[PDB]
Amino acid sequence: GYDRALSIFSPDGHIFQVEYALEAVKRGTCAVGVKGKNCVVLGCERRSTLKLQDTRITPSKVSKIDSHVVLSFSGLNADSRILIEKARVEAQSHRLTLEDPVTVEYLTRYVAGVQQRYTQSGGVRPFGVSTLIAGFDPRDDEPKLYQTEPSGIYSSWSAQTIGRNSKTVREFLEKNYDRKEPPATVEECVKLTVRSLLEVVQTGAKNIEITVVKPDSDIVALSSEEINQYVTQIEQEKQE
Amino acid sequence: NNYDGDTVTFSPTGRLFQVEYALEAIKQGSVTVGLRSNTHAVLVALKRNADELSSYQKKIIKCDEHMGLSLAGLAPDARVLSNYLRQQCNYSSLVFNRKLAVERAGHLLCDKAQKNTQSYGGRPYGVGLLIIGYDKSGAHLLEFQPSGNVTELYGTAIGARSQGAKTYLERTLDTFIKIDGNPDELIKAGVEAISQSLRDESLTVDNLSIAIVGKDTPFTIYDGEAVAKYI
Amino acid sequence: GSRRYDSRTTIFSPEGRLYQVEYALESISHAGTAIGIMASDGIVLAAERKVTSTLLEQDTSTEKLYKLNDKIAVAVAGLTADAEILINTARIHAQNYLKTYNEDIPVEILVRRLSDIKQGYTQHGGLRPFGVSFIYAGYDDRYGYQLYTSNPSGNYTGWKAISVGANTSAAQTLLQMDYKDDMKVDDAIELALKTLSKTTDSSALTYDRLEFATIRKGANDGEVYQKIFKPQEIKDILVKTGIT
Amino acid sequence: TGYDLSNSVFSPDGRNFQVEYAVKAVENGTTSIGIKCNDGVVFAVEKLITSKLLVPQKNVKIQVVDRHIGCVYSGLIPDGRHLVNRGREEAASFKKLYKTPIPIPAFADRLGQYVQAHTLYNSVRPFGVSTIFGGVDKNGAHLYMLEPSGSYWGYKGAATGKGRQSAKAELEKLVDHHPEGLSAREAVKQAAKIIYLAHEDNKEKDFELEISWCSLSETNGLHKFVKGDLLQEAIDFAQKEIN
Amino acid sequence: MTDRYSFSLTTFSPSGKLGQIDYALTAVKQGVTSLGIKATNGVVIATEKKSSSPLAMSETLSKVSLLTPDIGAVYSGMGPDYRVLVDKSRKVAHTSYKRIYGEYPPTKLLVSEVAKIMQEATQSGGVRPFGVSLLIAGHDEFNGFSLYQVDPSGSYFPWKATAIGKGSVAAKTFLEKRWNDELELEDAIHIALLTLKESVEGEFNGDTIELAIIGDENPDLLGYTGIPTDKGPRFRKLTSQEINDRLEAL
Amino acid sequence: GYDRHITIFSPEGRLYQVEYAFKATNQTNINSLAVRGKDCTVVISQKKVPDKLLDPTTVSYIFCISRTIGMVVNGPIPDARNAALRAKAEAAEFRYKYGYDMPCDVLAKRMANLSQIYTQRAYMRPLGVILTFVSVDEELGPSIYKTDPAGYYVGYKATATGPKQQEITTNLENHFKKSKIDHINEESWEKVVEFAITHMIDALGTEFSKNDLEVGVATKDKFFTLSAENIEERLVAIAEQ
Amino acid sequence: TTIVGVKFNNGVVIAADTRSTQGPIVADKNCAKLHRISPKIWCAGAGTAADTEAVTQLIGSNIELHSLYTSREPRVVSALQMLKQHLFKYQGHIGAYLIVAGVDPTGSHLFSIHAHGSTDVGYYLSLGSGSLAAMAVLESHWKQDLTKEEAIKLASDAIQAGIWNDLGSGSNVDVCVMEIGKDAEYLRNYLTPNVREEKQKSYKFPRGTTAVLKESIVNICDIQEE
Amino acid sequence: SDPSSINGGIVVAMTGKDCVAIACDLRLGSQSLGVSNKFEKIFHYGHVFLGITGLATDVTTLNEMFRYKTNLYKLKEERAIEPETFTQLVSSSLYERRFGPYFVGPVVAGINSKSGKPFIAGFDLIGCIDEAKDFIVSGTASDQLFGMCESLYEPNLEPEDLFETISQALLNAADRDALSGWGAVVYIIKKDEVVKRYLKMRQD
Ligand SMILES: [Cl-]
Ligand SMILES: [Mg+2]
Ligand SMILES: [Mg+2]
Ligand SMILES: [Mg+2]
């Protein structure tokens, strides 16, 4: 079998294949995650270079791993499917053996472990994907939001963004998100998430996707018109 | 130069550079001495610390009741090779009810090291070993190089500044070979030998490591206050 | 040893791109143009054969349009031999699904499977990727008529109208201009042929340089029919739409 | 260029440079010889005394295969040991299936094919030894010499190592002056002389002589080391000839 | 040992070219000319027996090979590569078809299997592509007579008539002027001999030309009688004498 | 320029490692010749023993593959013996599996197929040898089939191999142009060997002693090599007319 | 089953009955037991019918490939060697008992083969449940230097003995003649001594005799256009 | 215990003038217990019809397997498989499980679309082909079917006469078998029309 060590150290102590995988993430469409007091919202950018697209059937950017956990990503689309499939299989395996669904932290730790493994295994390249994993632990009402990256490191975030121009939207979130008082309602959380994407997106039309996850497996994706109403209200307050 | 990228490549003059580079790791290692009489065989090793808070790296490894070695170079490679010797000594005892001859132990180490010098993907071992033992033909001392070359000697030294100890043993040859039935005097000769390789530093109580095997003496290692008697 | 001669087909560039995928896409841009258009009452697949000869036996020839099952077909752009390897795998997957569940495979599930196979060749194995882009035209009872595309990276997306191969930039602009949502198959047939006629590198668009197919519910009552057009039938539709 | 960086690559000449570089390692080694006598073979080798600390007579170089074959080699000593280990496996499997001990020509090809196999791929390195070997079988005495390329022939006398040119000239004199043949005891004496004469190419350090033999009359066709009085007698004969 | 070349030796260059396939096609271009013509009641395939030495017996070297009783093959390019492909093609006709369906494969599907083998030598680890282009002629009940070309890439195309190798460009032009859909087999053989003469320098006779047909069933070549449905092979290699007879009416 | 190190195509569609293996073929500086009689096939080859320390009886490039098949090799001895061992194994296996002796042309094809694989697979190098197989086949009669590093093989009326193959080839060509038959019209193999040696002497322009040649003869149901004294008898007959 | 093989002047003949059974029930009354391995190598099989049929086609397939590889017409000894080694490997679990006969460049040959892998040579052989009846006839009338006409007569007489006396055998006699320098002639139903007599009554029913619940047209055509 | 008689059932096929007929009962049982009266044992792939008796799980599995294989055949060959070819495919597929076989008794029936010739064939569980010209029988009442067919059958029956013959052969054979019955179906097959008829019979 093909055994070649593709991920190796350089004289300055860097693993370039892992670092170049991050550059693929930088190219991917922007993704953002914001947790409120009783919810988490995942926002995603859709590049409008592709029209004549069939939006019914085109792969959506946010994926359910289980009924209570979701995963979004920035980077190589094909690579992300492999991580999503593995995560979905592990979620069902956990239910089968432990008789309890995965915690958001456990599912994050698994996906991050897979990513790390692909950085010191022979004959494979790292995943060109960073992920945002969000949801609620079984029988728990505390919101959860985690991030993973090609190297395999992971951590919890009050709010985070990944992908192209994520430096800009992180700037926005760092001055607009207060830890002592997070977005108390679904409305406030969605509004702050749409606002953060409007710093980067272009037209607020079919370029913004929003998914709301609440406790007890309550997950719903907002439609074009519902998001369009947030886009409208934000700029009418801005004209002042 | 263009011929040192892997162990599977001869140079135009017939040299194997990866093996020569592995030999270089031994020269960077701390000094260790081996010598024997007709009744006993002795190892003396200068242990190296990282700093003043750190411990002194152990240099001597027991392989059986009648055999053991000292190392100089990559310590993990010595652990792999000493583990192999432990297994081979053990196979001989379990299957044949026979203590493994020191000479045969040398042959086995040679062949194990050789396979890593002729194949792609692998690397040579980066450690030198001094094996002492007492078997059915008396006391023995062996020197192992990761090129595969194993040599039986009266005395020797490997590591940094080992040339000073080796010359001393070459002078003292006729004296220390006759030290029969006196373990303390044979160790004294070994401690005096390793002293010819010291600069700036001297032999302290946590610096010195000594091992001995003989006629009615199982392979035993002395460290700490057990070597203060010889300082 | 052998490392010396390894091209390392599955590595990132400093910019985070996959060399071999990018170069395989460059190869595909020289292949004959294939177009897919989705309407309310069916799907059209149109594709241009590459500079042919008068001595080529056209009526027994197939290089562009392939049947995967009775409900799903593909248009090919790239290395034909590479495509046939993947096509046979896709045909087997469809039959595996039919045997397991006793239902025809949903279009997206087949597309995802082939796309995952392409992805694997970019991440492990040290082999070159498949130099192929597909347009998938299909029908199932969940989403109805569907168009997808996949490329050597293993990424796939859904479309109302799409082109692959040569001159996709020009073709996609022309499709974006004249496509409407309430369009019908007969209108889509005309759009596909008009677009190829304008984007082609040949002097004129004739029957012997085309492969054509429709997927219609124009099959007697609630069922779907695939129609791979014959050379004479392509000649007739060219006259009907006023191109020859 | 670059044809010499990888094993099994033909140069534009039709040469395998990696095999030619292995020969350089052989030429760098100590002198070893073989003499075919009336009813057997004699092997001898030069052992350089690097230091007084080397235990005399202990670091044995000549190796036995089965009970009737002797092997000696010049170059990388570990490579030679690896080849003898394989030879011992080949001889064991032959005797297992066919009962009779392996004939010398049969044994020669087994080593030859194995050494040749290490010139077919870039994943392995050629052997850095030339091996002189032989013994007695049902058809009489046989002496062979095997090179890094896998090439081997039968010999009346053979030599390899740093002092091979000197040794070869001495062997050629014996062939000319004895068309009828040489006795086993004569061959031991002559082998001692030739190693002593060949030691001029390695004159810096002193050396230790090591001799072995297989003879139908003298050793019953078994390989034995020359020891004690017979070794000293050969050393005396050798020392007398150099003075 | 072990084959440590588990990686592709054919890869895409920045321009999108697969170098090793292009170079294989160059080797085919240097090869001796071979051709194929399809008639209404048969197919003919032909090539020159370029003998390497006059001391060599060129009858012992077969450039035109029977794959099945109704399918034959000819090549241009590297002879040894062709020989092993014929061995593999003969075997795959049995293992992947005859041992399953109890009958020989149709021409298009055997061609498909040969193409697959040639495609894999273009992607698999530690191998180069085959340096040949094949012309495969055959007949089967439901498809009738057919002629296919297979290239180093694994791509295959059906032809009414074509040529490959040295003088293919000139030969294909010659065939375009002469071919029609009303040709009888004897007319196609005549055209084949005319076309092949242009690319041949030296001797042009039955001993220097190799020619075979896919035509009528040959019950005389079956080797047994008694089964009405078995009527014999449609592949037949023309003799030296049979070629020379048609060179007088040339 | 790694297309010159392994067996992949150069931009001209060439395999350089195969071409360089053909050059290794002439490294021994030995010429061989093969001809067919009515009932036999004869192969002769030059024998050179440059060292006096060598045992001349062990220096040989002719091999007895099976009872019926003989093989002469042009190229270095390690690769020659590699090919010899394999050919012997293949011939023995064939007889076991299919119940009859492996034909000369079939063995040649098999070894040619093996050679072809080395030109296509990167990890294996070509063998730097040309193999000439000879026999009296039970179906085809006297047979000469020759294999090379490219994987090419063909039957021969007669053939020659080595540095001076062209001189021998042209000499043989001219004889068969006169006689207008595909073989040496002679009853005994002794006279066919005499023909072979005579025409090699003519072509090379050199005289031979009994130790300068090596001869193999194939008859119905056996292949054998001649001793030095058998060759001497052959040389005496040539000189006496 | 009764199968025989008989050598003659310039070749060999094999013959067989045409009854195949499932316990005491006759499954097929006109079975074909003479198989072709190659144009001029034929064999007849007794035992497990699927095994004789399968092992014949496998070896026949490999024989064809071997013939193409070697550019030589197949030999009977090759078919024999390949059959016995295959059957020995499966230790009798493949229940094929065969009589193999044919002509090739070496001459004419006749062998038999038993499921465990043992082979036999002979001028006359018989296999199957009716082999003892057949061998009785062969031992009574066989002589050296039989003509083609005499060998066909002897072979069919031996099969008849099996047909009439063995319950495992019946119906018709099939023959195949393989002569040197000629095409093998397969004579299907060479003898037909067991035609059923006309029945006493016709059992054709009046139309409408069978009670029917439902009728419907079955769509065997593919999905239609328009 | 005997796998071929756990579930029960029968299939019969016959040839006529320019036509073929294939018929089966509808019972599925667990030994003495009747479980289903709608278990049809005849399937079709294009114009080729396949009846299967024996262990019901294997009947279902083999139908799914031959649908799988004939679908791939059609995609590659660009034509529907013929009865003669399909017969060889059934034989090949059964023999590949020589030492772990499907416990079934398949029956093929159909008309060759090019020659127009009527075709029937039968197999044992391990692949041996029975290519009769007249009739083929299979199942737990095969003895009874052999008796009916041998007396009732005559060659060159017209389609509507062949229907009566095969129907009476099935019905009366099934009524002498405990594990067969509970309904019956008859297919009458012509070159381009196939009629399917369900028969009225005793339900014990
Ligand atoms: Cl082969
Ligand atoms: Mg190669
Ligand atoms: Mg009943
Ligand atoms: Mg009842």
Short mmCIF file of N, CA and C in Angstrom, two decimals, chain A residues 52-146:
data_model
loop_
_atom_site.label_atom_id
_atom_site.label_comp_id
_atom_site.label_asym_id
_atom_site.label_seq_id
_atom_site.Cartn_x
_atom_site.Cartn_y
_atom_site.Cartn_z
N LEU A 52 -28.49 29.98 -11.55
CA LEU A 52 -29.00 28.80 -12.26
C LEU A 52 -28.82 27.54 -11.40
N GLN A 53 -28.46 27.73 -10.13
CA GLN A 53 -28.38 26.64 -9.16
C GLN A 53 -29.77 26.19 -8.74
N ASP A 54 -29.92 24.88 -8.52
CA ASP A 54 -31.15 24.32 -7.97
C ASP A 54 -30.95 24.18 -6.46
N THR A 55 -31.56 25.09 -5.71
CA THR A 55 -31.35 25.18 -4.26
C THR A 55 -32.08 24.10 -3.46
N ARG A 56 -33.05 23.43 -4.08
CA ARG A 56 -33.78 22.34 -3.43
C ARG A 56 -32.84 21.17 -3.16
N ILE A 57 -32.00 20.87 -4.15
CA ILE A 57 -31.21 19.63 -4.17
C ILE A 57 -29.71 19.83 -3.90
N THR A 58 -29.20 21.03 -4.15
CA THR A 58 -27.80 21.36 -3.86
C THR A 58 -27.49 21.09 -2.38
N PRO A 59 -26.36 20.42 -2.10
CA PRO A 59 -25.94 20.17 -0.72
C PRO A 59 -25.96 21.44 0.15
N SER A 60 -26.73 21.39 1.24
CA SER A 60 -26.80 22.50 2.19
C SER A 60 -25.55 22.52 3.08
N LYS A 61 -25.20 23.71 3.56
CA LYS A 61 -23.93 23.92 4.26
C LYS A 61 -23.95 23.41 5.71
N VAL A 62 -25.12 23.43 6.34
CA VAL A 62 -25.29 22.92 7.70
C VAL A 62 -25.85 21.50 7.63
N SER A 63 -25.22 20.57 8.35
CA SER A 63 -25.61 19.16 8.34
C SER A 63 -25.94 18.66 9.75
N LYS A 64 -27.07 17.97 9.88
CA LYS A 64 -27.42 17.29 11.13
C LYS A 64 -26.56 16.04 11.28
N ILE A 65 -25.86 15.94 12.41
CA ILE A 65 -25.10 14.74 12.76
C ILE A 65 -26.00 13.79 13.54
N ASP A 66 -26.82 14.36 14.42
CA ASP A 66 -27.90 13.65 15.09
C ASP A 66 -29.07 14.63 15.20
N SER A 67 -30.15 14.22 15.86
CA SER A 67 -31.33 15.09 16.00
C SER A 67 -31.08 16.31 16.90
N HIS A 68 -29.97 16.31 17.63
CA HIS A 68 -29.67 17.36 18.61
C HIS A 68 -28.34 18.10 18.36
N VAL A 69 -27.56 17.64 17.37
CA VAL A 69 -26.27 18.26 17.05
C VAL A 69 -26.17 18.54 15.55
N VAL A 70 -25.60 19.69 15.21
CA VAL A 70 -25.38 20.07 13.81
C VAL A 70 -23.91 20.41 13.56
N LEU A 71 -23.51 20.34 12.29
CA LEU A 71 -22.14 20.64 11.89
C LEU A 71 -22.14 21.50 10.63
N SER A 72 -21.42 22.62 10.68
CA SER A 72 -21.14 23.43 9.49
C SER A 72 -19.63 23.49 9.30
N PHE A 73 -19.19 24.00 8.15
CA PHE A 73 -17.77 23.96 7.80
C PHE A 73 -17.34 25.03 6.80
N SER A 74 -16.03 25.25 6.74
CA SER A 74 -15.40 26.05 5.69
C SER A 74 -14.21 25.27 5.13
N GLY A 75 -14.10 25.23 3.81
CA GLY A 75 -13.00 24.53 3.14
C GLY A 75 -13.49 23.64 2.01
N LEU A 76 -12.77 22.54 1.78
CA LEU A 76 -13.10 21.62 0.70
C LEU A 76 -14.40 20.88 0.98
N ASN A 77 -15.36 21.02 0.06
CA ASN A 77 -16.70 20.46 0.23
C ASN A 77 -16.69 18.93 0.24
N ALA A 78 -15.90 18.35 -0.66
CA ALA A 78 -15.79 16.89 -0.76
C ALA A 78 -15.18 16.28 0.50
N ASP A 79 -14.16 16.94 1.04
CA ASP A 79 -13.53 16.50 2.30
C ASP A 79 -14.51 16.49 3.47
N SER A 80 -15.38 17.50 3.52
CA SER A 80 -16.33 17.64 4.63
C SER A 80 -17.33 16.49 4.71
N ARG A 81 -17.71 15.94 3.55
CA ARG A 81 -18.65 14.82 3.49
C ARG A 81 -18.10 13.59 4.21
N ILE A 82 -16.80 13.37 4.11
CA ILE A 82 -16.15 12.22 4.77
C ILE A 82 -16.19 12.38 6.29
N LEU A 83 -15.93 13.59 6.78
CA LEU A 83 -16.01 13.88 8.22
C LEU A 83 -17.45 13.80 8.74
N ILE A 84 -18.40 14.26 7.94
CA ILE A 84 -19.81 14.22 8.31
C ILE A 84 -20.32 12.79 8.41
N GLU A 85 -19.96 11.95 7.44
CA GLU A 85 -20.36 10.54 7.44
C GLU A 85 -19.80 9.81 8.65
N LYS A 86 -18.51 9.99 8.92
CA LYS A 86 -17.86 9.37 10.08
C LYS A 86 -18.52 9.80 11.39
N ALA A 87 -18.84 11.09 11.50
CA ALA A 87 -19.48 11.63 12.70
C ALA A 87 -20.88 11.05 12.90
N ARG A 88 -21.63 10.92 11.82
CA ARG A 88 -22.98 10.35 11.86
C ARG A 88 -22.96 8.88 12.29
N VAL A 89 -21.99 8.12 11.78
CA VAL A 89 -21.81 6.71 12.16
C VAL A 89 -21.45 6.59 13.64
N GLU A 90 -20.53 7.44 14.11
CA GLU A 90 -20.11 7.42 15.51
C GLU A 90 -21.24 7.82 16.47
N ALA A 91 -22.09 8.74 16.03
CA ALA A 91 -23.24 9.17 16.82
C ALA A 91 -24.21 8.01 17.07
N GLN A 92 -24.46 7.21 16.04
CA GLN A 92 -25.33 6.04 16.16
C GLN A 92 -24.66 4.92 16.95
N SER A 93 -23.35 4.76 16.78
CA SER A 93 -22.59 3.77 17.54
C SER A 93 -22.60 4.09 19.04
N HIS A 94 -22.52 5.38 19.37
CA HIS A 94 -22.57 5.83 20.77
C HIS A 94 -23.93 5.54 21.40
N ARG A 95 -25.00 5.82 20.67
CA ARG A 95 -26.36 5.50 21.13
C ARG A 95 -26.54 4.00 21.35
N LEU A 96 -25.92 3.20 20.49
CA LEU A 96 -26.06 1.74 20.53
C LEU A 96 -25.36 1.11 21.73
N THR A 97 -24.18 1.61 22.08
CA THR A 97 -23.36 1.01 23.15
C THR A 97 -23.55 1.68 24.52
N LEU A 98 -23.60 3.01 24.56
CA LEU A 98 -23.78 3.75 25.82
C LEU A 98 -25.25 3.95 26.20
N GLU A 99 -26.16 3.73 25.24
CA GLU A 99 -27.60 4.00 25.43
C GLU A 99 -27.89 5.45 25.83
N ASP A 100 -27.17 6.37 25.18
CA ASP A 100 -27.35 7.80 25.39
C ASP A 100 -26.74 8.52 24.19
N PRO A 101 -27.41 9.57 23.66
CA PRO A 101 -26.79 10.29 22.55
C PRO A 101 -25.50 11.01 22.95
N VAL A 102 -24.66 11.30 21.96
CA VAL A 102 -23.38 11.98 22.20
C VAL A 102 -23.58 13.37 22.80
N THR A 103 -22.65 13.77 23.66
CA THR A 103 -22.55 15.17 24.06
C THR A 103 -21.90 15.91 22.90
N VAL A 104 -22.09 17.22 22.84
CA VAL A 104 -21.52 18.03 21.77
C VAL A 104 -19.99 17.98 21.85
N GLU A 105 -19.46 17.98 23.07
CA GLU A 105 -18.01 17.91 23.30
C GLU A 105 -17.42 16.58 22.83
N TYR A 106 -18.12 15.48 23.09
CA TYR A 106 -17.67 14.16 22.65
C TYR A 106 -17.60 14.07 21.13
N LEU A 107 -18.65 14.53 20.46
CA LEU A 107 -18.73 14.49 19.00
C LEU A 107 -17.62 15.35 18.39
N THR A 108 -17.37 16.51 18.99
CA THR A 108 -16.27 17.38 18.59
C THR A 108 -14.92 16.68 18.76
N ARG A 109 -14.72 16.06 19.92
CA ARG A 109 -13.48 15.35 20.23
C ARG A 109 -13.21 14.21 19.24
N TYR A 110 -14.27 13.54 18.78
CA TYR A 110 -14.14 12.47 17.80
C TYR A 110 -13.69 13.01 16.44
N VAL A 111 -14.41 14.01 15.93
CA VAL A 111 -14.10 14.61 14.63
C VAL A 111 -12.69 15.19 14.61
N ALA A 112 -12.32 15.86 15.70
CA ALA A 112 -10.98 16.42 15.85
C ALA A 112 -9.91 15.33 15.87
N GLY A 113 -10.24 14.19 16.48
CA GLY A 113 -9.35 13.04 16.50
C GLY A 113 -9.10 12.46 15.12
N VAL A 114 -10.14 12.40 14.30
CA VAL A 114 -10.03 11.93 12.92
C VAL A 114 -9.12 12.87 12.13
N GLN A 115 -9.31 14.17 12.30
CA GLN A 115 -8.49 15.17 11.62
C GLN A 115 -7.02 15.06 12.00
N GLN A 116 -6.74 14.88 13.29
CA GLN A 116 -5.36 14.73 13.78
C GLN A 116 -4.71 13.49 13.17
N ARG A 117 -5.42 12.37 13.20
CA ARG A 117 -4.93 11.10 12.65
C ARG A 117 -4.43 11.25 11.21
N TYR A 118 -5.15 12.04 10.41
CA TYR A 118 -4.76 12.30 9.02
C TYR A 118 -3.56 13.26 8.88
N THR A 119 -2.97 13.69 10.00
CA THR A 119 -1.75 14.51 9.98
C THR A 119 -0.49 13.74 10.37
N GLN A 120 -0.63 12.52 10.90
CA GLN A 120 0.53 11.64 11.09
C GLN A 120 0.24 10.18 10.74
N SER A 121 -0.46 9.99 9.62
CA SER A 121 -0.63 8.67 9.02
C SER A 121 0.00 8.68 7.63
N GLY A 122 0.65 7.57 7.27
CA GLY A 122 1.31 7.46 5.98
C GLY A 122 0.32 7.37 4.83
N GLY A 123 0.66 8.00 3.71
CA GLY A 123 -0.12 7.89 2.48
C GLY A 123 -1.39 8.71 2.39
N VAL A 124 -1.62 9.60 3.37
CA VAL A 124 -2.81 10.45 3.38
C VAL A 124 -2.45 11.92 3.58
N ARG A 125 -3.29 12.81 3.07
CA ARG A 125 -3.15 14.25 3.32
C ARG A 125 -4.19 14.72 4.33
N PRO A 126 -3.90 15.82 5.05
CA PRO A 126 -4.87 16.36 6.01
C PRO A 126 -6.17 16.83 5.35
N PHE A 127 -7.23 16.90 6.14
CA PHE A 127 -8.50 17.46 5.67
C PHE A 127 -8.36 18.97 5.52
N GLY A 128 -8.79 19.50 4.38
CA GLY A 128 -8.80 20.94 4.14
C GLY A 128 -10.10 21.54 4.64
N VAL A 129 -10.41 21.29 5.91
CA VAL A 129 -11.70 21.65 6.49
C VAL A 129 -11.55 22.07 7.95
N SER A 130 -12.21 23.17 8.31
CA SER A 130 -12.47 23.52 9.71
C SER A 130 -13.97 23.44 9.93
N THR A 131 -14.38 23.03 11.12
CA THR A 131 -15.80 22.82 11.40
C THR A 131 -16.28 23.63 12.60
N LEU A 132 -17.57 23.96 12.58
CA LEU A 132 -18.27 24.49 13.75
C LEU A 132 -19.34 23.48 14.14
N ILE A 133 -19.25 22.96 15.36
CA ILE A 133 -20.17 21.94 15.85
C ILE A 133 -20.98 22.53 17.00
N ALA A 134 -22.31 22.49 16.87
CA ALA A 134 -23.21 23.13 17.82
C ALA A 134 -24.40 22.25 18.17
N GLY A 135 -24.95 22.47 19.37
CA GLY A 135 -26.12 21.73 19.83
C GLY A 135 -26.30 21.77 21.34
N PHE A 136 -27.10 20.85 21.86
CA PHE A 136 -27.36 20.75 23.29
C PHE A 136 -27.18 19.31 23.76
N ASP A 137 -26.48 19.12 24.87
CA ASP A 137 -26.33 17.79 25.47
C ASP A 137 -27.69 17.24 25.87
N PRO A 138 -27.86 15.90 25.83
CA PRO A 138 -29.14 15.30 26.24
C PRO A 138 -29.58 15.74 27.64
N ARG A 139 -30.84 16.17 27.75
CA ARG A 139 -31.43 16.63 29.02
C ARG A 139 -30.69 17.83 29.63
N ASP A 140 -30.12 18.68 28.77
CA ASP A 140 -29.39 19.87 29.21
C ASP A 140 -29.83 21.07 28.38
N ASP A 141 -29.94 22.23 29.03
CA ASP A 141 -30.40 23.45 28.37
C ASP A 141 -29.29 24.49 28.18
N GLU A 142 -28.04 24.10 28.46
CA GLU A 142 -26.89 24.98 28.26
C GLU A 142 -26.40 24.86 26.81
N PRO A 143 -26.32 26.00 26.08
CA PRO A 143 -25.87 25.97 24.68
C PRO A 143 -24.40 25.57 24.53
N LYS A 144 -24.09 24.85 23.46
CA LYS A 144 -22.73 24.38 23.18
C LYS A 144 -22.30 24.77 21.77
N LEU A 145 -21.07 25.26 21.64
CA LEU A 145 -20.49 25.62 20.35
C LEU A 145 -18.99 25.34 20.37
N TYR A 146 -18.54 24.47 19.48
CA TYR A 146 -17.12 24.10 19.39
C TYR A 146 -16.57 24.33 17.99
#
